[PDB]
């Protein structure tokens, strides 16, 4: 409602005053978000979409749409191990890589059949 904001700005005008101390300056800037949250933590403001270690380390659940005994598993276990040890990529970002691999392998069907090894 516009009237709620109209009544809130009147309150804000009365509460707002010129700063008398640097302590008040720092308090106001911290409440606004300019000042760092002390004690400083290098992970403040970043939550990685609320994921945990099992969304990063364990990626074998995304390898179901691949041949289990073929060389595709041997190739993809290395990329999953790399993504698990990669801290610079997110869980959703790794999903893009594995889905791109799924799409590419399922698109290039003639070559995998001509290679002599059965693949799905």
């Amino acid at each position: 409602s516009l009237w709620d904001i109209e009544f809130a700005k009147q309150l804000a005008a009365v509460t707002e005053r010129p700063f008398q101390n640097g302590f008040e300056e720092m308090i106001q800037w911290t409440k606004e978000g300019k000042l760092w949250e002390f004690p400083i933590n290098n992970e403040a403001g970043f939550d990685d979409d609320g994921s945990e270690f099992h969304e990063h380390i364990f990626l074998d659940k995304y390898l179901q749409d691949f041949p289990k005994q073929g060389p595709i598993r041997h190739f993809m276990e290395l990329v999953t191990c790399g993504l698990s040890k990669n801290p610079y990529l997110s869980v959703k970002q790794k999903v893009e890589h594995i889905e791109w691999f799924r799409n590419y392998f399922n698109e290039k069907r003639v070559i995998l059949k001509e290679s002599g090894i059965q693949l799905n």
Partner: protein, 99 residues
């Protein structure tokens, strides 16, 4: 080297998340390809040169608005004015060679 030690190492790699089956060093490169960020995605690489256009445009706009005073550009303008008054200015595009 024994089968017991091989099984122990294979299980240790599985529990630590390393590569389970034996693989060659040349094929191990794909592991490092994903374990670390690529060079083109590094912040020290893709953010090497600051956007000089932003700085130049902001400074010129401030100078025209009347907040920043650029001595170098003022000197350039004074020299250009003096050269044009002397008689050697900037030729118009399309007539320098033909006309």
């Amino acid at each position: 080297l024994s089968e017991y030690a091989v099984r122990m190492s294979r299980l240790s790699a599985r529990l630590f998340g390393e590569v389970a089956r034996p693989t060659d060093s040349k094929s191990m490169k794909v592991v490092k390809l994903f374990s670390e960020q690529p060079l083109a995605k590094r912040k020290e690489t893709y953010d090497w040169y600051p956007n000089h256009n932003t700085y130049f445009a902001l400074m010129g706009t401030l100078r025209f608005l009347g907040l920043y005073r650029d001595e170098h550009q003022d000197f350039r303008d004074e020299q250009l004015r003096l050269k044009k008054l002397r008689g050697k200015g900037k030729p118009r595009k399309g007539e320098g060679k033909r006309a």
